Design a protein around this motif. Structure first.
Motif, short mmCIF file in Angstrom:
data_model
loop_
_atom_site.label_atom_id
_atom_site.label_comp_id
_atom_site.label_asym_id
_atom_site.label_seq_id
_atom_site.Cartn_x
_atom_site.Cartn_y
_atom_site.Cartn_z
N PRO A 123 1.87 13.72 -16.26
CA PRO A 123 0.51 13.99 -16.73
C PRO A 123 0.05 12.43 -16.63
CG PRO A 123 2.17 14.95 -17.67
CD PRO A 123 2.58 14.32 -17.11
N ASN A 124 -1.08 12.54 -15.87
CA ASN A 124 -1.68 11.05 -15.70
C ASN A 124 -2.96 10.93 -15.33
OD1 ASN A 124 -2.43 8.30 -14.13
ND2 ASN A 124 -0.85 8.15 -13.96
N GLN A 125 -4.13 10.79 -16.07
CA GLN A 125 -5.31 10.63 -16.31
C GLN A 125 -6.11 10.38 -14.52
OE1 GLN A 125 -5.85 13.25 -18.39
NE2 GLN A 125 -7.48 12.89 -16.96
N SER A 126 -5.57 9.39 -13.82
CA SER A 126 -6.19 8.66 -12.14
C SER A 126 -6.37 9.61 -11.21
CB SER A 126 -5.47 7.18 -12.53
OG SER A 126 -4.36 7.04 -11.81
N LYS A 147 -6.72 13.35 -9.31
CA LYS A 147 -7.74 13.88 -8.82
C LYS A 147 -7.54 15.48 -9.73
CE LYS A 147 -9.71 16.86 -5.05
NZ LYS A 147 -9.86 17.40 -3.35
N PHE A 148 -5.90 15.48 -9.29
CA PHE A 148 -4.80 16.61 -10.49
C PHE A 148 -4.91 16.12 -11.91
CE2 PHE A 148 -5.53 18.69 -6.20
CZ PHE A 148 -7.16 19.22 -6.54
N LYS A 149 -5.09 15.70 -12.26
CA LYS A 149 -4.23 14.96 -13.57
C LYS A 149 -3.04 14.71 -13.88
CE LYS A 149 -9.03 14.74 -13.91
NZ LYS A 149 -10.06 14.07 -14.04
N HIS A 150 -2.46 14.31 -13.00
CA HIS A 150 -1.49 14.62 -12.65
C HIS A 150 -0.29 13.60 -11.62
CE1 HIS A 150 -1.98 17.29 -15.49
NE2 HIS A 150 -0.64 18.09 -15.58
N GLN A 151 0.54 13.48 -11.32
CA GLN A 151 1.09 12.66 -9.97
C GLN A 151 2.82 13.92 -9.48
OE1 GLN A 151 3.42 8.78 -10.47
NE2 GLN A 151 3.71 8.63 -7.76
N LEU A 152 2.83 13.95 -8.41
CA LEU A 152 3.82 14.66 -7.38
C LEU A 152 4.84 12.99 -7.77
CD1 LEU A 152 2.31 17.36 -5.75
CD2 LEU A 152 3.46 17.86 -6.88
N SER A 153 5.44 13.39 -8.41
CA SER A 153 6.97 12.06 -8.14
C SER A 153 8.27 12.78 -7.22
CB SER A 153 7.39 12.05 -9.78
OG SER A 153 8.14 10.39 -9.05
N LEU A 154 8.35 12.22 -7.05
CA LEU A 154 9.83 12.72 -6.16
C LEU A 154 11.09 11.52 -5.64
CD1 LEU A 154 8.49 14.47 -3.10
CD2 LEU A 154 8.89 15.08 -4.85
N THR A 155 12.29 11.39 -6.36
CA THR A 155 13.16 10.64 -6.59
C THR A 155 14.18 10.74 -6.49
OG1 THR A 155 11.50 9.85 -8.32
CG2 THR A 155 14.19 8.67 -7.91
N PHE A 156 15.17 10.17 -4.71
CA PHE A 156 16.45 10.25 -4.64
C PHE A 156 17.09 8.91 -5.41
CE2 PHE A 156 20.03 8.31 -2.30
CZ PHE A 156 20.84 9.46 -2.29
N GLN A 157 18.27 9.71 -6.52
CA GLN A 157 19.17 8.12 -7.71
C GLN A 157 20.56 8.76 -7.22
OE1 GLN A 157 19.33 9.41 -11.92
NE2 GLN A 157 17.40 8.19 -11.59
N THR A 168 2.08 23.96 -17.25
CA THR A 168 1.20 23.03 -17.50
C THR A 168 0.02 22.73 -16.86
OG1 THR A 168 3.30 21.98 -18.43
CG2 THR A 168 1.88 20.84 -18.69
N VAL A 169 0.24 22.04 -15.34
CA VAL A 169 -0.68 22.23 -14.93
C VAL A 169 -2.24 22.70 -14.49
CG1 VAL A 169 -1.56 21.16 -12.15
CG2 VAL A 169 0.72 21.08 -13.39
N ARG A 170 -1.36 23.75 -14.44
CA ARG A 170 -2.32 25.60 -14.43
C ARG A 170 -3.46 25.56 -15.21
NH1 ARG A 170 -1.72 29.54 -10.53
NH2 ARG A 170 0.54 28.15 -10.88
N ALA A 171 -2.33 25.41 -16.67
CA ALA A 171 -3.57 25.66 -18.15
C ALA A 171 -5.02 24.03 -18.17
CB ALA A 171 -2.30 25.30 -19.03
#
Ligand SMILES: [Ca+2]
Ligand SMILES: [Ca+2]
Ligand code: NA
Ligand code: NA
Ligand code: NA
Ligand code: NA
Lengths: 155, 153
Positions: free
Chosen positions: B28-31, B33-43, B146-149
């Motif tokens: 969740p992040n208000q900056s 467009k769709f109020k969320h960031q899609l984040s990917l990580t290889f760890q 969560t996003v859909r709602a």
DNA sequence: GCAAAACGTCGTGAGACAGTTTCG
DNA sequence: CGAAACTGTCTCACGACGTTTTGC
């Protein structure tokens, strides 16, 4: 002795470096001449939902077995000859557990002579201490010092 | 793009299958467009005593960094272009995390499209749900639902 | 007597998120 | 804005032992 394919050994060495255990133990047991058994184990553990992967290792390595302990299962290889053959082939590719692998091979080669004299048995036990030190050991109880005291209280 | 040696990829695929994490999150992040960031990580995590191995990964993979978090340290690769290049070459040798790796590649390819339509963004969020389901997920909170709602409201 | 299996357990070394911030 | 970094921590999925039993 089974000859393993190089690509399988490269893959398995990476798997073992990150999620494998090369274990050496001194087990108190009165049926042995020096009152302890020297035990060596190559182990690969996975959450039980991935036990199939461990069953496949049994087929691929060609020896060993899998046991269940609730939430996880373990592939176990303790037969000495197969273990020596396997670690001999795997060790050139290990980056994190190479020293443990080589110490186990050293121990296996000296087992016959370790059975012949208490001093040699104790020396081999110090190599077990060395493996434990390289591992992330946290609950160890029987060490070469445990053995030294018993051998002295026997001779 | 960097081409990696197959022997290195075979070894690293084994390491990753047993001790690696391929992570996808919806933050969740208000900056956005769709109020969320899609984040990917290889760890790749290791007890800090072995952080040297992670430092060498930075050199061998050629991107990423190591962060320390007390008793353990993590090699982190989140940059999208290098992540796609790396997982494309690593995935053929993965036996336990190949499904997660391929879903991450799919998500990366659809990022441009996911930013032009709410339905498209949600579709990609469902692929994130799939990765979490494949992982040993235990503390997840934000899902496609969560996003859909949020978007509906 | 010793190899090997069988069974049992403490304390992580990771695994997989979550939340917040930076700056081209 | 938006990719990527910075920072924190809960909950295991293991890691590395331990003890006991089997049988040639
Ligand atoms: Ca590990
Ligand atoms: Ca693991
Ligand atoms: Na140690
Ligand atoms: Na899961
Ligand atoms: Na930036
Ligand atoms: Na037997």
């Amino acid at each position: 002795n089974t000859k393993y394919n190089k690509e399988f050994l490269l893959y398995l060495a990476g798997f073992v470096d990150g999620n494998g255990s090369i274990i050496a133990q001194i087990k108190p047991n009165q049926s042995y001449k020096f009152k302890h058994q020297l035990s060596l184990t190559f182990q690969v553990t996975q959450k039980t939902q991935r036990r199939w992967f461990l069953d496949k290792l049994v087929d691929e390595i060609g020896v060993g077995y899998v046991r269940d302990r609730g939430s996880v299962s373990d592939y176990i290889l303790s037969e000495i000859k197969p273990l020596h053959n396997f670690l001999t082939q795997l060790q050139p590719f290990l980056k994190l557990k190479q020293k443990q692998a080589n110490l186990v091979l050293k121990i296996i080669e000296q087992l016959p002579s370790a059975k012949e004299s208490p001093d040699k048995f104790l020396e081999v036990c110090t190599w077990v201490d060395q493996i434990a030190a390289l591992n992330d050991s946290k609950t160890r109880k029987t060490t070469s010092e445990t053995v030294r005291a018993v051998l002295d209280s026997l001779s």
